[PDB]
């Protein structure tokens, strides 16, 4: 009889009141002390328990964050690489960094920001960029980046 | 809201920078998480579609992990955002092993008829085709 595998067969994903964004906030600050701009989307998002942040999260903060869910007598979750409670994966509460252009968390790239898929939006950023107080060589480099989408 | 005349240019460059295998540690949004999922090859499988949208839409990870642990040989690159996956070689054999263990579990557990039905319902897999859809 496989006692550990049984845990996964009897397990049910948490509800809205369990393993929620509250634990994302808690583990984030815990993980930070073991080594942040906390924020409070016009489309459907699957996972709602992600604490959103306005700064980068180092590999150390992120690795410590995942270890906090470590739990013995459990199999290694092949998604996050942590032995954690079944159906309670820390990837669902990992804190996410927002893009200041759209206020949503996504990866850096050419076709990842929702705010750079419409020419009307790119122009609005070009006008805003003209009012920047940043060094000229950065405003120049950023202005070109916008034009490269047109 | 978060844009000001002191970070708008930096935000445009920071948010649009593309990934470079030659220089992978270049500061980029959620880089630590992107590298963690790249190492696990979750960006090249049945979730690659999602790596260009909101990270809160990558997948229902609570379920992806629950499925991945029920099928040790199921390639993780097969899991889909909702928990579905492309049937793997040892799929038919694992459902068999899962039922035996499940029944043995119910025996040792002092459950109630309504609760016994749920546990059996939780592990049902509808194989519509190339893809296997659980629950
Ligand atoms: Cl662990
Ligand atoms: Cl200027
Ligand atoms: Zn996990
Ligand atoms: Zn964005």
């Amino acid at each position: 009889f496989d006692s550990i595998l049984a845990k996964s067969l009897l397990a049910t994903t948490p509800k809205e009141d369990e393993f929620n964004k509250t634990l994302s906030t808690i583990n984030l600050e815990v993980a930070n002390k073991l080594t942040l701009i906390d924020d409070p989307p016009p489309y459907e998002i699957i996972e709602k328990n992600h604490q959103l942040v306005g700064r980068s999260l180092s590999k150390a903060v992120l690795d410590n964050f995942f270890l906090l869910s470590s739990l013995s007598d459990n199999v290694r979750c092949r998604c996050c690489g942590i032995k954690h409670l079944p159906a309670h994966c820390p990837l669902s509460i990992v804190p996410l960094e927002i893009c200041f252009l759209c206020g949503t968390p996504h990866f850096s790239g050419r076709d990842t920001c929702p705010m750079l898929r419409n020419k009307e939006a790119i122009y609005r950023l070009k006008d805003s960029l003209s009012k920047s107080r940043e060094p000229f060589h950065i405003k120049k480099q950023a202005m070109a980046r916008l034009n490269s989408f047109l | 809201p978060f844009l000001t005349p002191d970070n708008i240019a930096s935000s445009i460059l920071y948010s649009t920078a593309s990934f470079s295998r030659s220089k992978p540690d270049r500061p980029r949004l959620n880089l630590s998480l992107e590298l963690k999922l790249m190492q696990n090859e979750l960006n090249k499988g049945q979730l690659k579609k999602q790596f260009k949208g909101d990270l809160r839409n990558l997948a229902d990870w609570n379920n992806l992990s629950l499925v991945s642990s029920k099928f040790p040989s199921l390639p993780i690159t097969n899991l889909r955002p909702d928990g579905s996956f492309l049937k793997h070689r040892r799929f038919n054999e694992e459902i068999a092993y899962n039922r035996q263990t499940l029944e043995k579990a119910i025996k040792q557990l002092d459950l109630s008829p309504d609760k016994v039905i749920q546990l059996r319902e939780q592990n049902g897999v509808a194989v519509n085709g190339r893809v296997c859809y659980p629950t």
Side-chain angles (χ1 to χ4, degrees), chain A residues 1 10, chain B residues 99-111 115-117 119-120:
Chain A
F1 174 65
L10 312 168
Chain B
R99 290 197 209 171
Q100 306 180 24
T101 54
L102 177 61
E103 294 187 15
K104 297 176 191 178
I106 302 173
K107 278 187 170 189
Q108 312 189 10
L109 301 171
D110 59 346
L111 306 177
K115 292 170 180 174
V116 180
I117 299 166
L119 297 172
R120 284 155 171 165

mmCIF file of all heavy atoms in Angstrom, chain A residues 1 10, chain B residues 99-111 115-117 119-120:
data_model
loop_
_atom_site.group_PDB
_atom_site.id
_atom_site.type_symbol
_atom_site.label_atom_id
_atom_site.label_comp_id
_atom_site.label_asym_id
_atom_site.label_seq_id
_atom_site.Cartn_x
_atom_site.Cartn_y
_atom_site.Cartn_z
ATOM 1 N N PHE A 1 0.827 -1.200 0.000
ATOM 2 C CA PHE A 1 0.000 0.000 0.000
ATOM 3 C C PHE A 1 0.867 1.258 0.000
ATOM 4 O O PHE A 1 1.790 1.390 0.804
ATOM 5 C CB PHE A 1 -0.937 0.002 1.209
ATOM 6 C CG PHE A 1 -1.718 1.276 1.370
ATOM 7 C CD1 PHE A 1 -2.658 1.652 0.426
ATOM 8 C CD2 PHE A 1 -1.516 2.095 2.471
ATOM 9 C CE1 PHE A 1 -3.378 2.823 0.571
ATOM 10 C CE2 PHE A 1 -2.235 3.266 2.622
ATOM 11 C CZ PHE A 1 -3.167 3.631 1.671
ATOM 12 N N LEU A 10 -6.696 11.448 -2.192
ATOM 13 C CA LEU A 10 -7.715 11.974 -1.296
ATOM 14 C C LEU A 10 -7.697 13.494 -1.219
ATOM 15 O O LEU A 10 -8.571 14.079 -0.570
ATOM 16 C CB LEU A 10 -7.526 11.393 0.110
ATOM 17 C CG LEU A 10 -7.340 9.878 0.207
ATOM 18 C CD1 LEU A 10 -6.871 9.497 1.601
ATOM 19 C CD2 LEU A 10 -8.627 9.147 -0.143
ATOM 20 N N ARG B 99 -6.530 3.241 -8.585
ATOM 21 C CA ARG B 99 -7.765 2.679 -8.044
ATOM 22 C C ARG B 99 -7.471 1.715 -6.902
ATOM 23 O O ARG B 99 -8.112 1.775 -5.845
ATOM 24 C CB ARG B 99 -8.554 1.974 -9.146
ATOM 25 C CG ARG B 99 -9.168 2.902 -10.177
ATOM 26 C CD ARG B 99 -10.242 2.174 -10.967
ATOM 27 N NE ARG B 99 -10.394 2.695 -12.321
ATOM 28 C CZ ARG B 99 -11.144 2.124 -13.259
ATOM 29 N NH1 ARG B 99 -11.813 1.008 -12.993
ATOM 30 N NH2 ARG B 99 -11.226 2.665 -14.464
ATOM 31 N N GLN B 100 -6.511 0.808 -7.100
ATOM 32 C CA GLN B 100 -6.146 -0.132 -6.044
ATOM 33 C C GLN B 100 -5.806 0.610 -4.759
ATOM 34 O O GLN B 100 -6.377 0.337 -3.697
ATOM 35 C CB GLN B 100 -4.964 -0.995 -6.491
ATOM 36 C CG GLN B 100 -5.174 -1.725 -7.810
ATOM 37 C CD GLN B 100 -3.974 -2.563 -8.211
ATOM 38 O OE1 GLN B 100 -3.174 -2.965 -7.365
ATOM 39 N NE2 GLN B 100 -3.839 -2.823 -9.506
ATOM 40 N N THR B 101 -4.878 1.565 -4.842
ATOM 41 C CA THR B 101 -4.504 2.345 -3.668
ATOM 42 C C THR B 101 -5.701 3.095 -3.098
ATOM 43 O O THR B 101 -5.867 3.179 -1.876
ATOM 44 C CB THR B 101 -3.381 3.320 -4.025
ATOM 45 O OG1 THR B 101 -3.773 4.112 -5.153
ATOM 46 C CG2 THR B 101 -2.101 2.566 -4.356
ATOM 47 N N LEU B 102 -6.547 3.653 -3.969
ATOM 48 C CA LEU B 102 -7.728 4.370 -3.497
ATOM 49 C C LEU B 102 -8.630 3.454 -2.680
ATOM 50 O O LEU B 102 -8.995 3.775 -1.543
ATOM 51 C CB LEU B 102 -8.492 4.963 -4.682
ATOM 52 C CG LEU B 102 -9.804 5.680 -4.347
ATOM 53 C CD1 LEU B 102 -9.564 6.867 -3.423
ATOM 54 C CD2 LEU B 102 -10.512 6.127 -5.618
ATOM 55 N N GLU B 103 -9.001 2.302 -3.244
ATOM 56 C CA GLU B 103 -9.870 1.373 -2.529
ATOM 57 C C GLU B 103 -9.254 0.966 -1.195
ATOM 58 O O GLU B 103 -9.932 0.960 -0.160
ATOM 59 C CB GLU B 103 -10.150 0.144 -3.394
ATOM 60 C CG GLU B 103 -10.962 0.439 -4.646
ATOM 61 C CD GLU B 103 -11.364 -0.820 -5.389
ATOM 62 O OE1 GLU B 103 -11.271 -1.917 -4.798
ATOM 63 O OE2 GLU B 103 -11.771 -0.713 -6.566
ATOM 64 N N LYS B 104 -7.965 0.617 -1.200
ATOM 65 C CA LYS B 104 -7.288 0.283 0.049
ATOM 66 C C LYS B 104 -7.376 1.435 1.040
ATOM 67 O O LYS B 104 -7.592 1.220 2.239
ATOM 68 C CB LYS B 104 -5.826 -0.074 -0.220
ATOM 69 C CG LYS B 104 -5.629 -1.307 -1.084
ATOM 70 C CD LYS B 104 -4.155 -1.531 -1.385
ATOM 71 C CE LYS B 104 -3.956 -2.582 -2.462
ATOM 72 N NZ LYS B 104 -2.517 -2.765 -2.795
ATOM 73 N N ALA B 105 -7.209 2.669 0.560
ATOM 74 C CA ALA B 105 -7.335 3.830 1.434
ATOM 75 C C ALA B 105 -8.724 3.892 2.058
ATOM 76 O O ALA B 105 -8.863 4.023 3.279
ATOM 77 C CB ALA B 105 -7.035 5.109 0.652
ATOM 78 N N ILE B 106 -9.767 3.785 1.230
ATOM 79 C CA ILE B 106 -11.134 3.866 1.739
ATOM 80 C C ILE B 106 -11.358 2.823 2.827
ATOM 81 O O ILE B 106 -12.028 3.089 3.833
ATOM 82 C CB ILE B 106 -12.143 3.710 0.584
ATOM 83 C CG1 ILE B 106 -11.904 4.783 -0.486
ATOM 84 C CG2 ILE B 106 -13.571 3.805 1.114
ATOM 85 C CD1 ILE B 106 -12.738 4.608 -1.742
ATOM 86 N N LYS B 107 -10.803 1.622 2.646
ATOM 87 C CA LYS B 107 -10.931 0.582 3.661
ATOM 88 C C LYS B 107 -10.420 1.067 5.011
ATOM 89 O O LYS B 107 -11.120 0.970 6.026
ATOM 90 C CB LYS B 107 -10.169 -0.670 3.227
ATOM 91 C CG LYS B 107 -10.916 -1.569 2.262
ATOM 92 C CD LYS B 107 -10.140 -2.853 2.035
ATOM 93 C CE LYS B 107 -10.954 -3.885 1.282
ATOM 94 N NZ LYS B 107 -10.249 -5.193 1.264
ATOM 95 N N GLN B 108 -9.193 1.593 5.043
ATOM 96 C CA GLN B 108 -8.603 2.020 6.306
ATOM 97 C C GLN B 108 -9.289 3.264 6.854
ATOM 98 O O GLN B 108 -9.270 3.496 8.069
ATOM 99 C CB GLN B 108 -7.107 2.277 6.122
ATOM 100 C CG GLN B 108 -6.375 1.163 5.387
ATOM 101 C CD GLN B 108 -4.870 1.340 5.411
ATOM 102 O OE1 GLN B 108 -4.345 2.198 6.121
ATOM 103 N NE2 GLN B 108 -4.166 0.528 4.631
ATOM 104 N N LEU B 109 -9.896 4.070 5.987
ATOM 105 C CA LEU B 109 -10.570 5.292 6.400
ATOM 106 C C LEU B 109 -12.004 4.988 6.815
ATOM 107 O O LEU B 109 -12.700 4.202 6.165
ATOM 108 C CB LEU B 109 -10.555 6.322 5.268
ATOM 109 C CG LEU B 109 -9.169 6.742 4.766
ATOM 110 C CD1 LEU B 109 -9.293 7.587 3.505
ATOM 111 C CD2 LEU B 109 -8.399 7.490 5.844
ATOM 112 N N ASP B 110 -12.439 5.617 7.908
ATOM 113 C CA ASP B 110 -13.791 5.442 8.433
ATOM 114 C C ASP B 110 -14.639 6.591 7.892
ATOM 115 O O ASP B 110 -14.958 7.555 8.587
ATOM 116 C CB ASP B 110 -13.774 5.397 9.961
ATOM 117 C CG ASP B 110 -13.182 6.650 10.577
ATOM 118 O OD1 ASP B 110 -12.542 7.432 9.840
ATOM 119 O OD2 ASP B 110 -13.349 6.851 11.800
ATOM 120 N N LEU B 111 -15.005 6.474 6.619
ATOM 121 C CA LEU B 111 -15.687 7.545 5.911
ATOM 122 C C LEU B 111 -17.201 7.376 6.019
ATOM 123 O O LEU B 111 -17.710 6.560 6.794
ATOM 124 C CB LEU B 111 -15.238 7.574 4.451
ATOM 125 C CG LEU B 111 -13.731 7.664 4.211
ATOM 126 C CD1 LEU B 111 -13.449 7.616 2.722
ATOM 127 C CD2 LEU B 111 -13.149 8.926 4.831
ATOM 128 N N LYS B 115 -19.226 10.717 1.410
ATOM 129 C CA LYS B 115 -17.813 11.062 1.289
ATOM 130 C C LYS B 115 -17.043 10.023 0.482
ATOM 131 O O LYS B 115 -16.076 10.370 -0.205
ATOM 132 C CB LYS B 115 -17.195 11.224 2.680
ATOM 133 C CG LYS B 115 -17.709 12.440 3.441
ATOM 134 C CD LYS B 115 -17.272 12.427 4.901
ATOM 135 C CE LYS B 115 -17.796 13.649 5.644
ATOM 136 N NZ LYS B 115 -17.509 13.594 7.104
ATOM 137 N N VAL B 116 -17.449 8.752 0.548
ATOM 138 C CA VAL B 116 -16.776 7.721 -0.237
ATOM 139 C C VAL B 116 -16.989 7.965 -1.725
ATOM 140 O O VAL B 116 -16.087 7.740 -2.541
ATOM 141 C CB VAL B 116 -17.265 6.321 0.182
ATOM 142 C CG1 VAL B 116 -16.565 5.242 -0.633
ATOM 143 C CG2 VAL B 116 -17.030 6.090 1.669
ATOM 144 N N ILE B 117 -18.183 8.425 -2.103
ATOM 145 C CA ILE B 117 -18.474 8.678 -3.512
ATOM 146 C C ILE B 117 -17.581 9.789 -4.048
ATOM 147 O O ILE B 117 -17.071 9.708 -5.172
ATOM 148 C CB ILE B 117 -19.967 9.015 -3.692
ATOM 149 C CG1 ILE B 117 -20.836 7.840 -3.234
ATOM 150 C CG2 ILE B 117 -20.269 9.351 -5.150
ATOM 151 C CD1 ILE B 117 -22.298 8.187 -3.068
ATOM 152 N N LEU B 119 -14.510 10.800 -3.155
ATOM 153 C CA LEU B 119 -13.139 10.362 -3.403
ATOM 154 C C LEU B 119 -13.032 9.601 -4.718
ATOM 155 O O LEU B 119 -12.062 9.772 -5.466
ATOM 156 C CB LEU B 119 -12.649 9.496 -2.242
ATOM 157 C CG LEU B 119 -12.555 10.189 -0.881
ATOM 158 C CD1 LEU B 119 -12.260 9.167 0.202
ATOM 159 C CD2 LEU B 119 -11.494 11.280 -0.888
ATOM 160 N N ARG B 120 -14.017 8.752 -5.016
ATOM 161 C CA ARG B 120 -14.022 8.047 -6.294
ATOM 162 C C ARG B 120 -14.275 9.007 -7.451
ATOM 163 O O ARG B 120 -13.721 8.832 -8.542
ATOM 164 C CB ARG B 120 -15.072 6.937 -6.272
ATOM 165 C CG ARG B 120 -14.653 5.709 -5.480
ATOM 166 C CD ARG B 120 -15.856 4.931 -4.970
ATOM 167 N NE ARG B 120 -15.465 3.650 -4.385
ATOM 168 C CZ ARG B 120 -16.250 2.905 -3.611
ATOM 169 N NH1 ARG B 120 -17.477 3.306 -3.310
ATOM 170 N NH2 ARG B 120 -15.800 1.755 -3.130
#
